[PDB]
């Protein structure tokens with residue numbers, strides 16, 4: 001939900017730690033153009049521990 | 051005198067080393083993303099985890 005995003009040559013880098021990773025809030029946004037997942041399944045992200 | 055009973059010691063050491071190699075090959079990921087079946091089944095879908 002950030003208002004201003006960074007360019008592709010200077011992409012931002014946020015670190016997620018010490019929090020409950022509830023990926024259900026991601027689906028609340030607009031329909032995605034590409035939701036490809038590599039090495040993980042998009043359905044079982046809420047049960048994994050990273 | 052040392053190495054007097056080396057014949058039986060060699061046999062038992064070969065057996066122990068074969069067992070250690072067999073148990074160490076379990077942790078070797080042969081091209082897979084992980085060496086644990088639980089880390090693959092609980093992370094990937096069946097058609098991709100197979």
Ligand SMILES: *[C@@H]1O[C@H](CO)[C@@H](O)[C@H](O)[C@H]1NC(C)=O
Nearest residue numbers: 001002003025027028029030
């Ligand atoms: C995203 O940000 C806009 C602007 O603040 C807001 O109106 C909208 O509700 C936000 N969307 C979500 C899912 O929070």
